[PDB]
Chains A and B, each alone.
Chain A
Amino acid sequence: TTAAPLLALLRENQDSVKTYALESINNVVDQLWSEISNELPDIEALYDDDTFSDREMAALIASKVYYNLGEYESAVKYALAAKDRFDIDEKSQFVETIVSKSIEMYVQEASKQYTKDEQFYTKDIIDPKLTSIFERMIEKCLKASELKLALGIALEGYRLDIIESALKSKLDQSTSENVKIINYLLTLAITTVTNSKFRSSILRKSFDFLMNMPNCDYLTLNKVVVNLNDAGLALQLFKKLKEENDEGLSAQIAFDLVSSASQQLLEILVTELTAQGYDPALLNILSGLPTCDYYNTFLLNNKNIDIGLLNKSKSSLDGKFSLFHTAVSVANGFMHAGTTDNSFIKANLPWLGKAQNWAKFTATASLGVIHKGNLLEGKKVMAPYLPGSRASSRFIKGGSLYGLGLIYAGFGRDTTDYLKNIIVENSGTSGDEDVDVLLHGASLGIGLAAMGSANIEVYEALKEVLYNDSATSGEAAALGMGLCMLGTGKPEAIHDMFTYSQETQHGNITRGLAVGLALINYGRQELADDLITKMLASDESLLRYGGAFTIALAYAGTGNNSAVKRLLHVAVSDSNDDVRRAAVIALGFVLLRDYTTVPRIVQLLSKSHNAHVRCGTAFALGIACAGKGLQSAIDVLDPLTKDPVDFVRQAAMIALSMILIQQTEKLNPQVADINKNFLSVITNKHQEGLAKFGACVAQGIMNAGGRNVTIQLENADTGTLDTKSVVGLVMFSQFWYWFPLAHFLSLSFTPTTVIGIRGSDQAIPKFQMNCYAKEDAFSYPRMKYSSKPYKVDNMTRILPQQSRYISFIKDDRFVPVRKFKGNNGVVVLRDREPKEPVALIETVRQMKD
């Protein structure tokens, strides 16, 4: 009925009569689409006709027919053909649908066209019909002051025109909203945009607006330099810092980037900045001279060892050979880290009597964490055990060379020349086992000193050690060369180290080379897929062990859906328990970004029958959940503690201490059960050696630095993430082979202190904010919004996470400026106008300065 006969009249003559016929159809296009469905071939056949001028009204009819037919994409073509009868300003569900479909089709096409050309939005490469609605709707949202739809689609659509045009027009320069708008772009572009080049342009475009520093935020400019690692933009800020004359304006950039950039980019801020000019006051700051001196004085003032709980752990039994005396020494050195005090080595005579030549190495290595951070007297501590002073034996002499590595790591350029001379002397031949110990300890020391820095002398010196095929020092060669190849690395060293793995079949060399090939692939992402294929195809157990962490390091930081798919396939098809354990641990390093989905994945794998998978997912859960929230992951590790298997409980106790750090005293109700298990596992005679070692080290991690330091992993506050923390966490999976890799965890332990730090040199004042604070201030090991101000302010542990709720009063005369930051681990921030006769209180700290 109605227009039904008018549909078949389109084949008659008198096209002028058809004009009045199509007008009556325009009313029923939204009513009955059934009769039109049979006439659709006739309606479209008249569109291409040159003598048919009604295509404007003809396209309007088919717009609401194919739409009601169930094809949304087809209705977009008819709506964009006429470009007349379609009303973009009409308010209806039909018009709003085509807009959503046309923009969605524009994103799918412009996604793959951004790689070929970035000018596509200025050219005809994309159909102008899709850009007609797309360009007008984004400009319509700009007039409505809506940045969600304008900036949200531009990031997904991969268009640089909207980002630049909108940000310039919305400038309020307040110096407030313009900073948040940029922050919304950097936060979403990392998770949404997969392309690293598109997000790289956003960092460069937003850099030109704030390059003059119109009272902007230093947090935004610091994320651009670290992420891009560009030498031009790194020194571009200092060029503006020279124009404006201020003592502390360059401090916030200097003190933040010294702990921000990796060893590669720090060389640009020191060596490359020297040629272009710098500030003599910032010479030591950018080189990290006071940075080491800061962390030494943080843990020295307040240190609570609580030997009452420590003595009961190591006095339980004198047996278990050196395994018992080593685990209690490693957990003890964590509490003395940076304070340069030895309770176990000095104050306790008898516990060193049963140590043999093999135990003296790990006992000496405990002092490396204790004295870590000493740039001057670190040699005087090991001086009797250093070469030239001989030693009680040549086995313990090698421990002094390894102790210098943990202390001087990354700053050891001075110690680098001393350690490589011993390697050359021992590279020719070795007739004794203790000779390799001196070569093993010196290689691990130079590897940490040159870690992150590419050095051709270290690669060539350790390469000759690999040719000797040593069963002791052969592992340190690949580990030392791998730390120098961090980052992009040398593509030639990838195939060279991989060839030596297939030639020499070893027990530690082949597994060590797999770790070295993983470190060089860190940050390469898809660039390492060539070597990953060779490891997955090989049937060697040691090559498959390092293939999982190769994916973990390359895909670290920003995650990948294909990286998780590859790791889950290895932990299933492969029957090797060590590879299944290594694959599930690699899952955490890829999932670091999103910690909410981590406990759900590892819990499904913890229900299987394999003990190594349950043990691997035990510590893999405590990695990303350590310095983050979501305390419900403890319930996932609860059934793993009751597992009678010895090594499953070891990795479970360590992961509990990482998540529960600073969670005591009315924060997590489960902290009461973990504090009892500290001495419950050791004193229990039914427990095994591996079970007692997991509970003993876990107690030392929570009490490390006098129960102060915490594990900071993936701090976005900076350019992205903390690199030195990931290095130690990958190592914890490898434990019982030769030496425990928990020693390298000290790189992830940093103190949280709020202290003045005058912009000139150093301050260490005494001041009290008298505002909100956590309850861990007075919390010490024994034998929301609180509305109540607290007098505990300067230094003194507590929680860096909840510091965002702290308020400020006058207190010190220097006063706050920018409302600070809220990150406790920065420990420096900025002081305003030093040299004020406020009668400042200072410490000594003259030994290392």
Chain B
Amino acid sequence: EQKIQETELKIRSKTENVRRLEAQRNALNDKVRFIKDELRLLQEPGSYVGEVIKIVSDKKVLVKVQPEGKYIVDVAKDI
């Protein structure tokens, strides 16, 4: 195992070199994915602003928009 033991250092050498270069690529993969995920959020038309007036048992809430008028809208299923 003279050649096997001598070439064993090349295993740990190249392994530690490639893994530490993956963190830079994984960081770039996270930055591109983050910018791509934030791109569809800016392309979204967005949302208005309003204030809750009154609520009922029908899950319909009256929200008063400042520029617009008062609108009765349905609450989300998460709340």
Contacts and interface: CB of A to CB of B under 8 A. Distances in A.
B54 interface: no
The interface centre, meaning the residue of B2, B3, B33 with most chain A CB atoms within 10 A of its CB, is: B2
A15 interface: no
Contacts of B29: 607-609
B26 A96 contact: no
B8 interface: no
Contacts of B3: 100, 104
A607 B32 contact: no
B22 interface: yes
Chain B interface mostly: helix
Nearest to A93: B2
The interface centre, meaning the residue of A96, A97, A604, A609 with most chain B CB atoms within 10 A of its CB, is: A609
Interface in A89-132: 96-97, 100, 104
Nearest to A604: B22
Contacts of A608: 29, 33
Interface string B33-55: 10010000000000000000000
A604 B29 CA distance: 10
Contacts of B26: 604, 607
Interface string A598-611: 00000010011100
Nearest to A686: B77
B19 to A, nearest CB: 10
A609 B2 contact: no
Contacts of B36: 609
Given A100-B3, A104-B3, A609 B22 contact: no
A44 B2 CA distance: 30
B11 to A, nearest CB: 13
A706 to B, nearest CB: 40
Nearest to A97: B2
A134 to B, nearest CB: 14
Contacts of B30: 607
A96 B5 CA distance: 14
Interface in A602-627: 604, 607-609
B2 to A, nearest CB: 5
B2 A96 contact: yes
A609 B36 CA distance: 8
A100 B2 contact: yes
B35 to A, nearest CB: 9
Contacts of A607: 26, 29-30
Interface bracket on A: under 10
B8 to A, nearest CB: 15
A609 B30 CA distance: 7
Contacts of B33: 608-609
Interface in A794-809: none
A197 to B, nearest CB: 26
Nearest to A103: B3
B37 to A, nearest CB: 9
B29 to A, nearest CB: 5
A96 B26 CA distance: 46
A826 to B, nearest CB: 36
B40 to A, nearest CB: 12
Contacts of B32: 609
A609 B33 CA distance: 5
A609 B37 CA distance: 9
Nearest to B35: A609
A608 B33 CA distance: 8
A683 to B, nearest CB: 16
A100 B4 CA distance: 11
Contacts of A100: 2-3
A97 B6 CA distance: 12
Contacts of A104: 3
A400 to B, nearest CB: 46
A327 B19 CA distance: 41
A741 to B, nearest CB: 30
Nearest to B4: A152
A157 to B, nearest CB: 13
Nearest to B31: A609
A100 B6 CA distance: 11
Contacts of A604: 22, 26
Contacts of A96: 2
Contacts of B2: 96-97, 100
A147 to B, nearest CB: 14
Nearest to A99: B2
B14 to A, nearest CB: 14
A97 B2 CA distance: 9
Nearest to A606: B29
Contacts of A97: 2
B60 to A, nearest CB: 21
A687 to B, nearest CB: 15
Nearest to B34: A609
A97 B3 CA distance: 10
Nearest to A608: B29
A845 B29 CA distance: 59
16 contacts: A96-B2, A97-B2, A100-B2, A100-B3, A104-B3, A604-B22, A604-B26, A607-B26, A607-B29, A607-B30, A608-B29, A608-B33, A609-B29, A609-B32, A609-B33, A609-B36
Interface of A: 96-97, 100, 104, 604, 607-609
Given A100-B3, A104-B3, A607-B29, 7 more contacts: A96-B2, A604-B26, A607-B26, A607-B30, A608-B33, A609-B29, A609-B36
Instruction: Please name the 7 residue pairs, one residue from A and one from B, whose CB atoms are nearest each other, closest first.
Output: A609-B33, A100-B2, A608-B29, A607-B26, A609-B32, A607-B29, A609-B36
